[PDB]
Amino acid sequence: YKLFITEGYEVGRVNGLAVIGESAGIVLPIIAEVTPSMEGRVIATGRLQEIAREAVMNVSAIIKKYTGRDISNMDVHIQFVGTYEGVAGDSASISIATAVISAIEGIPVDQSVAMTGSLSVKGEVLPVGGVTQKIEAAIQAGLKKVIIPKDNIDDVLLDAEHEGKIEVIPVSRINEVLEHVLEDGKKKNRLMSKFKELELAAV
Amino acid sequence: YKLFITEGYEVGRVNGLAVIGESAGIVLPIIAEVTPSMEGRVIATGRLQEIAREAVMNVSAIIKKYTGRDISNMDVHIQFVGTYEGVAGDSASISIATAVISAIEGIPVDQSVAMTGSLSVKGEVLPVGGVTQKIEAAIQAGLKKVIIPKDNIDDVLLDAEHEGKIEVIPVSRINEVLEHVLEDGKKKNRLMSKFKELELAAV
Amino acid sequence: YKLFITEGYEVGRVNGLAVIGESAGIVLPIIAEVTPSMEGRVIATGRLQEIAREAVMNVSAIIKKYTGRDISNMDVHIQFVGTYEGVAGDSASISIATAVISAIEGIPVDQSVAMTGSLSVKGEVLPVGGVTQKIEAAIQAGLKKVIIPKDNIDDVLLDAEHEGKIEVIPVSRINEVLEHVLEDGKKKNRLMSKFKELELAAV
Amino acid sequence: YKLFITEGYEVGRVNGLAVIGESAGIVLPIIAEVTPSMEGRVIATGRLQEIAREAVMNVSAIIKKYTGRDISNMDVHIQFVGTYEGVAGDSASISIATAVISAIEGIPVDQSVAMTGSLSVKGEVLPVGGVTQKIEAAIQAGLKKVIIPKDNIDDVLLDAEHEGKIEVIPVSRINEVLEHVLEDGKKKNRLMSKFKELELAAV
Amino acid sequence: YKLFITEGYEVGRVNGLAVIGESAGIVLPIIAEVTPSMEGRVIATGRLQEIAREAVMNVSAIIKKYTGRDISNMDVHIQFVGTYEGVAGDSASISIATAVISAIEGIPVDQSVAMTGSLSVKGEVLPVGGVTQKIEAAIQAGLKKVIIPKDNIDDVLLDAEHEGKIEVIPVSRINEVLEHVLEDGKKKNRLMSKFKELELAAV
Amino acid sequence: YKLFITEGYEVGRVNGLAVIGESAGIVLPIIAEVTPSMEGRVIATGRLQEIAREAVMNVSAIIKKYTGRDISNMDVHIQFVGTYEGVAGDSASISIATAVISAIEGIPVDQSVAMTGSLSVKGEVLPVGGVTQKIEAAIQAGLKKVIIPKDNIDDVLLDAEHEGKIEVIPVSRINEVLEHVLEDGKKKNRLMSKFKELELAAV
Ligand SMILES: [Ca+2]
Ligand SMILES: [Ca+2]
Ligand SMILES: [Ca+2]
Ligand SMILES: [Ca+2]
Ligand SMILES: [Ca+2]
Ligand SMILES: [Ca+2]
Ligand SMILES: [Ca+2]
Ligand SMILES: [Ca+2]
Ligand SMILES: [Ca+2]
Ligand SMILES: [Ca+2]
Ligand SMILES: [Ca+2]
Ligand SMILES: [Ca+2]
């Protein structure tokens, strides 16, 4: 069996990438759900709960500012698929941020696209460690594309055999992430139009 | 003596399945109780407390979203029946999730049906390891049926003698689990109607 | 000297039974005290601290649900009388649960009645191992009665000489335990009336 | 040189008694200090650290309940004076409990009075082994009095020559211990008045 | 890769300096965002959340008093770039305060200028520890200037080789910080004019 | 470096004194600022926030009654200079109360005068613990005078070498505190005249 889906579109699920030990890449899928608070909490458990809190708090800033969803009155549940000892995750992981946006908006995410990077509270995608090793894991999982922070482009060093097996997509900002992974449609168009101001503000 | 019941309907009790060591299956009954918080806590102890937290947090998302029970203001007590060294449980175990739903709703669970799988925060049943070995344990305990994640169907490899001794029921979603194990009646009908939106959302 | 009392009524003290090594029964008295938390902690130490946590967490569920004592804001101190290497205790020991109820309610427990069994979070008394050997220890200590889980009744096999020396009382539920060991009186009546709903719910 | 003081009053120091090997008594002085936690810890090391934890946890129950000191937010340091291989200490040693009370209250303890016994979480003094041999050690150290659990009174068997050399004081409860060893004064009066409810509750 | 930018102007981002362990300096970039509250919260997580609360509360005082922004009805998100164990940050870090002002005003901060210091609620820059070591980190990161509290000027002791590699700028007050790091322009002029009263009040 | 100023007059800043651990004195400067509320809040964070709330609420009573400042429509920011683990502050610390009065009135406080004491809602200065140890800290910091509650005068016990290094000023009431620390001038005269009724009422 496998804990990631390699093709198709799913709401609230993103193929993130992380490292186990010092150097081994893994596909680390994230599933998010948002609910009414019945003040909202970030609900997460385990070794990566701090990363979940970082990502959810940072994405909440951009959601409030640019989309106007009252995420402060929602509970946000973050699930990491596959428990591993010694996982090193991306600070403020963009995969978690993306899963939250997908969940709140009801817009499915392309499972063939893995991603790694850290979300700034301003909507920028900041560099992370282990990019080559994460890309390798994505290739071994049969994923088609991998989003990485633009500032990590020169960190990519793959074998000739692995090069060519995956499309590497460098990004500066969260809206480029959403452009590449969200399912095309009315909902996406509408959301992307709200995020345009983030791009205008950031350039 | 035995720590599982093999027939009849009980509130808040589910015959889960787990692995001890690398490969030996065990029946791992879960008993859950929900109480007023007198913010609610997940109350669990021992080697499997993290799995209990995962399952309770994930099921809380679907309970809040689809049933509107204020589970955030309840304490949720999870008990694993039978302490074993070296138990490997299902992440976000569906048996724990089911026991919690049964406890909150007061709808008994069929003890003749064992289950294994991991609950997503979206209500999906995700694949787990050791499915053949868990099925074997269910057969040795005299259980009639075993629910497994659909994605584990091709992981089943039983002897001719064991094949035929238990009905294997693959599932995609939590509501199918509840369909098969919850006692038929007004209460079930009412609950299943609330969970219908989960199925609509997930398909 | 002796570490158990064989007759009379004492608040917060119960003659539990356990096993040392594989098969030797022992009387294992438990003394409990509850205090204000000055969030409450289970305060216990030694080899059996996990069993103390299990029993206290499980009894807390029934105390909150049925009696409304704010046990969550109390510290609960569990003492095992007599340190032994290689003690195997009852999971969620009913003797610990009973001692806690006695301590919180100020209702003394009959020292002539030993007990063994595991408390479910629903208030059921679940079967345990070594029942014959525990009964033997109770007989050797000069105790008059021994409460055991009903599901262990067929596990009793005593010599003709030992048979007849102790009254074996099988139980299904915690309120039967309390019926047999708590001192008769206004306080007991009042508490038993609160626990009646547990019995109604469990039957 | 000697590791015990035989006369005078000292804060936080008690002449406990223990056994080395199977039968040889020793004077085992305890020194305790309480500090702010800067959740409080029991700080102890060596072969007897478990006994220190037992005694400190049990006395904490009575301190919280009857005196209202927030011992949960203090660190409690326990020192055993004289390291010996093969020391068998009293479970929940009353000497450790007494040293802690003396330290928290700033009321000195009479060094001419040795003691042995186990503290229950309810404030009772429970019987221990080796009482004759501990009394002998107290006599050889030149101590004037020895407190023992009342239930050990019939365990005393001294030579004619040793009989008569020490006053044996049997006790039921911790407040009798404190009555005999704490320095007379305003502080003692005040503390003894708080512990009166323990005696009322225990009789 | 690197987690700091060494040149250019960015809104809401400041190259702060901190210490890891006892003595090692690090560049600790801060990114801040302010949003509508949808009462405002300081939203921060991790080991340095208390410092973030201090800095945001202190800067809020000067923002309310001198600029009249209703920061009380904004959420203020603070992100520390790069998670490290054992970071010791500046109390009420001026880098956090500056990032908040930059974010609320939309005026970019010069990334070539690092800073360390503690903001008083009156707008003063108070001394901090580890100034030499922080300056060293700034030099190793390739930063051009470092702002330090004036009272730390005599704490600077750099090698001949490091001296000369960075401009050290001592400051008394927050407006001098803003003078040196904020991008020149209409927006800055306007803001600096509001802060002039702080300087008048503080001198 | 140092976190206190030892000479000169500063608005809103007071050299308070506190204890760390059980007995070590520290100089704990307080800085206060008052702003418009844009209902007013006490804005404080950290381990001492409750003391800040106490002091600000108590001083607000006397400010409203005797000076007529509408402090209810101001935010009051309290900053403790120097974070320490295990600080024990003065309940309703007079240093915090004084800093607030200084901030609201714009009258500087003499930094050479340290103080300790608790402010009553009636304007009295109530006794505190650790006075000798706080005085010692003031002496070690090079402060010239220390205000203490009159009822603590007999608690002072300094070495011959320390005696003589600081002027100890006992006080009954807040206006004596203000007499000794506020800068002489029109503003002070005016404020002291308003507080005269407090003294008349309290004598
Ligand atoms: Ca390509
Ligand atoms: Ca590409
Ligand atoms: Ca079949
Ligand atoms: Ca089937
Ligand atoms: Ca009989
Ligand atoms: Ca019977
Ligand atoms: Ca005598
Ligand atoms: Ca005697
Ligand atoms: Ca220069
Ligand atoms: Ca310079
Ligand atoms: Ca003088
Ligand atoms: Ca004087």
CA B2 to chain C, closest CA, distance in angstroms equals 7
Cβ-defined contacts of C149-155 (< 8 Å, 24+): C149/B1, C149/C116, C149/C117, C149/C118, C149/C125, C150/C125, C151/B1, C151/B2, C151/C126, C151/C127, C152/B1, C152/C117, C152/C127, C152/C128, C155/B1, C155/C127, C155/C131
Angle, helix C174-181 to helix C186-202, in steps of 10 degrees: 160
| Nearest by Cα to F94 from F152, F133, F52 | F52
Count of beta carbons in the 10 Å neighbourhood of residue D38 = 12
Q: Using the 8-state DSSP alphabet, how is residue B136 labeled?
A: H
Nearby residues of E137 by Cβ (< 8 Å), 6 or more positions away: E17, E24, E25, E26, E27, E114
Q: Using the 8-state DSSP alphabet, how is residue B183 labeled?
A: P
Query: In angstroms, what is the span from residue C184 Cα to ligand 6's centroid?
Result: 20
Angle, helix A174-181 to helix A94-105, in steps of 10 degrees: 60
List all chains that touch chain F, counting a touch as 3 or more CB pairs closer than 8 Å. Answer: D, E
Chain centroid, CA E167 distance in Å: 17
Nearby residues of B85 by Cβ (< 8 Å), 6 or more positions away: B20, B47
C-alpha–C-alpha distance, residues C30 and C79, integer Å? 6
* Ramachandran region, residue F106 (left: φ > 0; alpha: ψ -120 to 50; beta: rest): left
Q: Which two tokens stand for residue F42?
A: 């006490």
Query: In angstroms, what is the span from residue D96 Cα to ligand 8's centroid?
Result: 23
Helix or strand holding residue C105 (H, E) = helix C94-105
Cβ separation A45–B57 shorter than 8 A:
yes
Nearby residues of B127 by Cβ (< 8 Å), 6 or more positions away: A1, A2, A3, B117, B118, B149, B151, B152, B155
Burial of D188 (0-12, 13-18, 19+ CB in 10 A): middle
How many domains does chain B divide into?
Answer: 1
Q: Which chain C residue is nearest to residue B10, measuring alpha carbons?
A: C202
Count Cβ neighbours within 10 Å for each residue of B33-69 and write b for 16 or more, e otherwise: bbbeeeebebbbbbebbebbbbbbbbbbbbbbbbbeb
Nearby residues of F21 by Cβ (< 8 Å), 6 or more positions away: D35, D36, D38, F86
Residue D120 near residue D92, CB atoms below 8 Å: yes
DSSP annotation string for F67-80: H---GGGEEEEEEE
Q: What is the CATH number of the domain that holds F37?
A: 3.30.230.10
* Ramachandran region, residue F142 (left: φ > 0; alpha: ψ -120 to 50; beta: rest): left
End-to-end alpha carbon distance in chain D: 44
| Nearest by Cα to B91 from B5, B19, B35, B187 | B19
C-alpha–C-alpha distance, residues E180 and C137, integer Å? 83
Residue D126 near residue D21, CB atoms below 8 Å: no
Coil/strand/helix, residue B170: strand
| Nearest by Cα to E191 from E99, E97, E69, E78 | E69
Angle, helix D49-67 to helix D186-202, in steps of 10 degrees: 90
Ion ligand 5 nearby residues (CB, 5 A) = C 167
Q: What are phi and psi of D7, to 5 degrees?
A: -150, 155
DSSP annotation string for D154-168: GG----TTTTTSSEE
Residue with tokens 């119960």: C14
Touch test D–F: 3 Cβ pairs or more under 8 Å? yes
CA F159 to chain E, closest CA, distance in angstroms equals 32
Residue with tokens 């100890």: F168
| Nearest by Cα to E29 from A130, A203, A126 | A126
Nearby residues of F126 by Cβ (< 8 Å), 6 or more positions away: F91, F92, F117, F118, F119, F120, F149, F151
Burial of B121 (0-12, 13-18, 19+ CB in 10 A): buried
Q: Output the CA angle B179-B183-B185, nearest 5 degrees.
A: 95
Q: What are phi and psi of A175, to 5 degrees?
A: -70, -30
Within 8 A of F78 by CB-CB distance, chain E residues are 121
Query: In angstroms, what is the span from residue C169 Cα to ligand 6's centroid?
Result: 5
C-alpha–C-alpha distance, residues B123 and B45, integer Å? 25
Q: Output the CA angle D82-D83-D85, nearest 5 degrees.
A: 135
CA F21 to chain D, closest CA, distance in angstroms equals 6
Count of beta carbons in the 10 Å neighbourhood of residue C85 = 7
Beta-bridge partner residues of B110: B9
Touch test C–B: 3 Cβ pairs or more under 8 Å? yes
Half-sphere exposure at residue A116, Cβ-oriented, CA atoms within 13 angstroms: 30
F22 CB within 8 Å of a chain D CB:
yes
F53 CB within 8 Å of a chain E CB:
no
Q: Output the CA angle B92-C56-C76, nearest 5 degrees.
A: 130
Q: Which two tokens stand for residue C105?
A: 């309610």
Nearby residues of A141 by Cβ (< 8 Å), 6 or more positions away: A2, A4, A6, A15, A27, A114
Query: In angstroms, what is the span from residue B111 Cα to ligand 4's centroid?
Result: 18
Sign of CA dihedral F181, F183, F189, F195: negative
Q: Classify strands C109-110 and C113-115 as parallel, antiparallel or unpaired.
A: unpaired
Chain centroid, CA B74 distance in Å: 20
C-alpha–C-alpha distance, residues E163 and E157, integer Å? 9
Residue A56 near residue B60, CB atoms below 8 Å: no
Name the experiment that determined this structure: X-ray
Residue C150 near residue C170, CB atoms below 8 Å: yes
Q: Using the 8-state DSSP alphabet, how is residue D114 labeled?
A: E
E33 CB within 8 Å of a chain F CB:
no
Of F13, F33, F82, which is closest to E61 when you measure between CB atoms?
A: F33
Instruction: Name the residue type at position A140.
Output: Q
Q: Output the CA angle D176-D177-D178, nearest 5 degrees.
A: 90
Within 8 A of E128 by CB-CB distance, chain F residues are 1
Residue with tokens 């929940």: D92
Burial of B150 (0-12, 13-18, 19+ CB in 10 A): middle
CA D37 to chain F, closest CA, distance in angstroms equals 7
Instruction: Name the residue type at position F72.
Output: S
Residue A133 near residue A25, CB atoms below 8 Å: yes
Which ligand is located closest to the Cα atom of residue E144? Answer: 9
Domain housing C202: 1-203
Residue A171 near residue A124, CB atoms below 8 Å: no
Burial of F61 (0-12, 13-18, 19+ CB in 10 A): middle
C-alpha–C-alpha distance, residues A199 and A194, integer Å? 10
Quoted resolution (Å): 1.5
Within 8 A of A92 by CB-CB distance, chain E residues are 79
Q: Which two tokens stand for residue D19?
A: 């056994």
Nearby residues of B18 by Cβ (< 8 Å), 6 or more positions away: B25, B26, B28, B87, B88, B89, B90, B93, B116, B134
C-alpha–C-alpha distance, residues C128 and C125, integer Å? 9
Cβ separation F13–E129 shorter than 8 A:
no
Nearby residues of D121 by Cβ (< 8 Å), 6 or more positions away: C12, C31, C32, C33, C77, C78, C79, D57, D58, D61, D62
C-alpha–C-alpha distance, residues A93 and D191, integer Å? 57
Nearby residues of C134 by Cβ (< 8 Å), 6 or more positions away: C17, C18, C19, C25, C114, C116, C146, C148
Q: Which two tokens stand for residue F57?
A: 């609420």
Angle, helix A186-202 to helix A94-105, in steps of 10 degrees: 140
C-alpha–C-alpha distance, residues B136 and F195, integer Å? 85
Q: How far is CA D85 from CA B116, D46, D75, D129, in A?
A: 51, 10, 27, 18
List all chains that touch chain A, counting a touch as 3 or more CB pairs closer than 8 Å. Answer: B, E
C-alpha–C-alpha distance, residues E167 and E157, integer Å? 14
C-alpha–C-alpha distance, residues C68 and C52, integer Å? 21
Beta-bridge partner residues of A126: A118
- Residues of A labelled catalytic: 91, 134
Of B78, B81, B83, which is closest to C126 when you measure between CB atoms?
A: B81
Catalytic-labelled residue, pool E93, E95, E118, E134: E134
C-alpha–C-alpha distance, residues C190 and C66, integer Å? 12
Burial of F38 (0-12, 13-18, 19+ CB in 10 A): middle
Instruction: Name the residue type at position D172.
Output: S
Cβ separation F33–E65 shorter than 8 A:
yes
Residue A174 near residue A100, CB atoms below 8 Å: no
Query: In angstroms, what is the span from residue B159 Cα to ligand 3's centroid?
Result: 15
The residue among A27, A30, A38 with the most chain B CBs within 10 A of its CB, best to mutate, is: A38
Q: Which two tokens stand for residue E51?
A: 């410092």
Q: How far is CA E151 from CA B134, F72, F84, in A?
A: 69, 36, 21
Query: In angstroms, what is the span from residue E145 Cα to ligand 9's centroid?
Result: 9
Coil/strand/helix, residue F171: strand
Coil/strand/helix, residue D121: coil
Q: Which chain F residue is nearest to residue E66, measuring alpha carbons?
A: F35
Coil/strand/helix, residue E66: helix
C-alpha–C-alpha distance, residues D121 and B80, integer Å? 29
Beta-bridge partner residues of F167: F145
Nearby residues of C25 by Cβ (< 8 Å), 6 or more positions away: C17, C18, C19, C130, C133, C134, C135, C136, C137, C138
Strands (DSSP E) found in C89-195: 109-110, 113-115, 118-119, 125-126, 145-149, 167-171
| Nearest by Cα to F125 from F146, F100, F152 | F152
C-alpha–C-alpha distance, residues B35 and B166, integer Å? 35
| Nearest by Cα to F201 from F180, F173, F178 | F173
C-alpha–C-alpha distance, residues A117 and A174, integer Å? 10
Touch test C–A: 3 Cβ pairs or more under 8 Å? no
Half-sphere exposure at residue D52, Cβ-oriented, CA atoms within 13 angstroms: 24
Count of beta carbons in the 10 Å neighbourhood of residue C194 = 17
| Nearest by Cα to C111 from C131, C135, C137, C138 | C138
Residue C5 near residue C111, CB atoms below 8 Å: yes
Count of beta carbons in the 10 Å neighbourhood of residue D106 = 9
Q: What are phi and psi of F68, to 5 degrees?
A: 70, 15
Of C32, C38, C83, which is closest to D72 when you measure between CB atoms?
A: C38
CA D34 to chain F, closest CA, distance in angstroms equals 10
Q: Using the 8-state DSSP alphabet, how is residue D184 labeled?
A: P
